[PDB]
Structure 1
Amino acid sequence: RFLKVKNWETDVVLTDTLHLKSTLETGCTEHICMGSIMLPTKDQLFPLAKEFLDQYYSSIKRFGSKAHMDRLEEVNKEIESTSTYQLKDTELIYGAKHAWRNASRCVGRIQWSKLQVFDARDCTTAHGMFNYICNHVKYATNKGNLRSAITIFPQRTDGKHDFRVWNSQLIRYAGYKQPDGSTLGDPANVQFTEICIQQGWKAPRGRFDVLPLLLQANGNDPELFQIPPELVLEVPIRHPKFDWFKDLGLKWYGLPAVSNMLLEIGGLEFSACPFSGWYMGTEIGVRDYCDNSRYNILEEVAKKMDLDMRKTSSLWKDQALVEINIAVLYSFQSDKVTIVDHHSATESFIKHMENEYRCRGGCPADWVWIVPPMSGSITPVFHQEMLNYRLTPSFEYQPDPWNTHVW
C-alpha cells in the first residue's frame, strides 16, 4: 500500500504514497492491464469542491483555518443556491498548475510551477476568444524564447453553452487529399481541414498552410479567424551536414499548443483551455515527419542519403530517422527557438521524479508515453519503473465538437 518503484539502471528505489490520494479510474483491473490503450450535479459537486479546497488550503498551510472553513462554507453556500461556483483567481492558478503537475503522460513537467495562467473567464464571443488566443500566442512565443502558458475560458454550465476551440492545436498545418491518390500536407488534419473549408475557409492548398482558428463561444456556431502570420513563428529545417536537406522544403512551427482538452478543477469543467510550452525534438522529427499516417518523408530522405533501402536489416530507416532528428534540433537551435532533445528532457524528468517523491510522495507517470519514440533504452526513463494513477485537478480528453454541436 506504500509502493516502491525501482530504477534498473541505477538501483535507486522510491516509495510512492501519493497514489493513495488517487481518485479517477485507470481502466485496468487485476485481470487485465490497459496501460497501452490510447483513450479509456449539486450532490456530486460539493465533495469535489471540498477535496480541491482542502488540498489548496493545505498547500498554503491553512488547513483547518478560519479562511479555510469560511471558503468551504462560502462555496458550499454558492453550490446550494447556484448549482455551480466560481474559483478565486488564486485557486484558478493553483488548479491549473496542478493539472499540469498531474499529467502522467507529460515528460516536461519539471517546469510545472512556472505556468503563466491567463484568466479569460470574462470572455463572451469568438472574436473575444480570438483576441485572447492571439495574446496567448504572442506571450508564449516571446520571439523564440518560449514561455509556458494556459488561457482558461468560461467553465461549462449546462453543456449547451460550452466554449470550445475546435482545433486540436492552435497552430497546425492543413491536410488536403489528392484526386490521384494520397494526401498533401498533414494527413492527421485532413478531416479538420475539411470542416474549415466546409465551414467557409479558403485554403491556399499548399503543404504547410497554417490552419485558421475555429472558435466556439457559449455554444454558438464556431467562427474562422486567421492568426496573424507575424505571430506564427516557424523554423525552416536544414541539416548541419547535408546541404541537400533544405531542398526537401521542410519547416515546422515553434509553438506546440494543445487546444482541445478539458481542464477539471474542484469539479468544474473548463472545455476551452489552450495550453502551450515548447517542443521536445522527437515530437516533430520522429512523429510529425516519419509516422506513416503523417508526413512519412523517410522514403525520400533515405534515397537522398543513398542508403540500401532494399532490406530492413540495413537499418536505413533508423539512420535517416536519426539525421532528420539531428536537423530539427539543429534548426530550432540555430534560429534561437526553444527546443529540448529527448536525452535532456528524460533526464530532467528523472530529476523531477526524484523531487516529487522527495517533496510530495510520488509522481504519477505513464511509461508508454514518457519513453521517447526513438532510442528509448539509451534514455534514463526506459529503466525507470513508473506508477500510473489519475490525480485531480487534471486535463482530460473530450469528444470532438463537430460530432457534438447541436448545430
Structure 2
Amino acid sequence: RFLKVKNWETDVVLTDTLHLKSTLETGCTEHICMGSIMLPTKDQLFPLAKEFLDQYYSSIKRFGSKAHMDRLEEVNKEIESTSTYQLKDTELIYGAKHAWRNASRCVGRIQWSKLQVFDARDCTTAHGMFNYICNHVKYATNKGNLRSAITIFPQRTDGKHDFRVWNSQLIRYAGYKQPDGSTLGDPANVQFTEICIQQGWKAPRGRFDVLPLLLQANGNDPELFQIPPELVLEVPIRHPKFDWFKDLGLKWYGLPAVSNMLLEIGGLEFSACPFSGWYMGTEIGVRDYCDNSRYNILEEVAKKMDLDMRKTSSLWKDQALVEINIAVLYSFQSDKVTIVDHHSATESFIKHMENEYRCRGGCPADWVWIVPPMSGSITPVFHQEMLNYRLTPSFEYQPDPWNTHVW
C-alpha cells in the first residue's frame, strides 16, 4: 500500500503513496511483467471531469470552495447537454503541464512547470494549423536558446472531425530506398517520406532533407506545407579533435518536437498537441546515428579512427560511439543551441524525483526509458528503483492516422 523505492548507490529510501491515485492500467499482472513492451459517453465523461477538477481546485487551495462546486455544476450542466465540455484557459495550462509532469518515460521533467502553452483551440483549417505550428517552432527555437512549448488544437468531438499532425515530429529528415536496395537519409521515415511524395512533395533527393509538414484539420484530407528553412535551426556536426569528422557530412536539427501523441485532460482528447523542449545528446548520437536501422554510421566512424574492427572484443563500436556523442554535444554547444548531456539530465531527474517524493508523495517513472542507451551504470538513474504507474492528465500513443483516415 505504501511502497518504498531504494537507491542502491546512495541508500536513500523514498516512500510512494501517489500510486494509489493511479487510475489506468500498465499491461502487467500478478503473473507477468511487461515493463519492456513498447505499447501494451456522457457516462464516462463526468467522473473523469470531476476527478480532474478536484485536483485543479486542490492545487490552488480551493478544494470545497464555492467556485469549485459552481464549476463542477457548470461542467455537469454542460455535459448533460452538449455531450462534452470546454476547459478554461487556466485549466488547460494546468492540464498540459501535468500531463508532462506525469510522463513516466521523460527524464526531462524537472522543467515541467516552465511550459509555454499555446491555445490553438480556435483553429479551423490546415493553413491555420500551419500558422500556429510555425509560431510554435519560432518561439521554441528562440535563436538557439530553446524553450519548452505545446500547441493544443481543438479537442476531438465525435471522432469524425479530428485534427492530426501526420508527422511524428515537426522536423525530421527524409528517407528514400534506392534500386540499389539500400537507404538514403533516415530509414525511420521511408514510409512517411513516400506518402509525402504520394500526395505531392517534390523531394530534393538528398540525405538531410527536412520533411514537409502534412496537416489534417477537422477530419479533412491533409495538406503539404514547407516550414521555412529560416525557422529550422541546424547544427553541423564536428569533433573537437578529429578534423576528418566534419567530412562525414553530418548535421542535425536543434528542435525535437513530438507531434503524434494524444493529450487527455479531464476525459477530453486532444489528438494534435505537438510539444517541444530540447535534446539529450544521446538521442541523436546513440539512437539517430548509430542504430542499425537509422543512420548506422558506426562502421564508417570506426574506420576513420583506424580501430581494430576485426573482433567485437576490441570494443571498437563502443569507442566510436563515445567519440560520436562527444562530437554532437560539442557542436551544439559551440553553436549555442541548447542541449543536455546524459550525466547532467539523469542527475537532474534524481533531484526532481526527490522533489516529487516530498512535495507530492511520488513520481511515476519508467526505468527502461529513463536509463540512457549508453553508459547506463555510471549515471545515477541506473541504481534508482522506480515505480511505473499511469496518472492523468497524460500523453498517450494513438494509431498512425493513415491507418484510420477515410479520404
Q: CA deviation at 1:40?
A: 1.1
Q: CA deviation at 1:81?
A: 0.2
Q: CA deviation at 1:11?
A: 0.3
Q: CA deviation at 1:246?
A: 0.3
User: Unaligned stretches of 5+ in structure 1?
Assistant: none
The 2-side partners of 1:362 and 1:163 are apart by 34
**3-state SS of 1:290 partner:** coil
Q: For residues 137-166 of structure 1, what are the alpha-carbon distances to aligned partners after superposition, in whole Å with 9 as ceiling and x for unaligned?
A: 000000000000000000000100000000
Q: For residues 335-369 of structure 1, what are the alpha-carbon distances to aligned partners after superposition, in whole Å with 9 as ceiling and x for unaligned?
A: 00000000000000000000000100000000000
Runs of 4+ in 1 over 6 A off after TM superposition: none
Q: CA deviation at 1:285?
A: 0.2
Q: For residues 309-358 of structure 1, what are the alpha-carbon distances to aligned partners after superposition, in whole Å with 9 as ceiling and x for unaligned?
A: 01000000000000000000000000000000000000000000000001
Does 1:13 pair with 2:17?
Answer: no
The 2-side partners of 1:42 and 1:205 are apart by 50
The 2-side partners of 1:176 and 1:40 are apart by 31
The 2-side partners of 1:239 and 1:163 are apart by 42
CA RMSD after TM alignment: 0.3
Q: For residues 233-269 of structure 1, what are the alpha-carbon distances to aligned partners after superposition, in whole Å with 9 as ceiling and x for unaligned?
A: 0000000000000000000000000000000000000
Q: CA deviation at 1:181?
A: 1.7
The 1-side partners of 2:153 and 2:252 are apart by 28
**3-state SS of 1:252 partner:** strand
Q: For residues 180-236 of structure 1, what are the alpha-carbon distances to aligned partners after superposition, in whole Å with 9 as ceiling and x for unaligned?
A: 121100000000001100011110010000000000000000000000000000000
The 1-side partners of 2:391 and 2:291 are apart by 31
Q: For residues 97-134 of structure 1, what are the alpha-carbon distances to aligned partners after superposition, in whole Å with 9 as ceiling and x for unaligned?
A: 00000000000000000000000000000000000000
Q: CA deviation at 1:304?
A: 0.3
The 2-side partners of 1:65 and 1:310 are apart by 72
The 2-side partners of 1:41 and 1:165 are apart by 26
Question: What is the TM-score with the length of structure 2 in the denominator?
Answer: 1.00
The 2-side partners of 1:249 and 1:41 are apart by 54
Q: Which residue of 2 aligns with 1:59?
A: 59
The 1-side partners of 2:84 and 2:181 are apart by 51
Q: CA deviation at 1:46?
A: 0.4
Q: Which residue of 1 aligns with 2:195?
A: 195
Q: For residues 70-118 of structure 1, what are the alpha-carbon distances to aligned partners after superposition, in whole Å with 9 as ceiling and x for unaligned?
A: 0000000000000000000000000000000000000000000000000
Q: For residues 35-86 of structure 1, what are the alpha-carbon distances to aligned partners after superposition, in whole Å with 9 as ceiling and x for unaligned?
A: 0000111000000000000000000000000000000000000000000000
Q: For residues 254-291 of structure 1, what are the alpha-carbon distances to aligned partners after superposition, in whole Å with 9 as ceiling and x for unaligned?
A: 00000000000000000000000000000000000000
The 2-side partners of 1:41 and 1:93 are apart by 25
Q: What is the aligned-residue identity percentage?
A: 100
Q: Which residue of 1 aligns with 2:250?
A: 250
**3-state SS of 1:349 partner:** helix
Q: CA deviation at 1:34?
A: 0.2
The 1-side partners of 2:130 and 2:293 are apart by 30
Question: What is the TM-score with the length of structure 1 in the denominator?
Answer: 1.00
User: Unaligned stretches of 5+ in structure 2?
Assistant: none
Q: Which residue of 1 aligns with 2:232?
A: 232
**3-state SS of 2:215 partner:** strand
Pairs aligned (count): 407
**3-state SS of 1:198 partner:** helix
**3-state SS of 2:199 partner:** coil
The 2-side partners of 1:318 and 1:336 are apart by 27
The 1-side partners of 2:188 and 2:147 are apart by 26
The 2-side partners of 1:181 and 1:84 are apart by 51
The 2-side partners of 1:40 and 1:167 are apart by 23
Q: Which residue of 1 aligns with 2:180?
A: 180
The 1-side partners of 2:284 and 2:93 are apart by 30
Q: Which residue of 1 aligns with 2:331?
A: 331
Q: CA deviation at 1:406?
A: 1.0
The 1-side partners of 2:66 and 2:52 are apart by 17
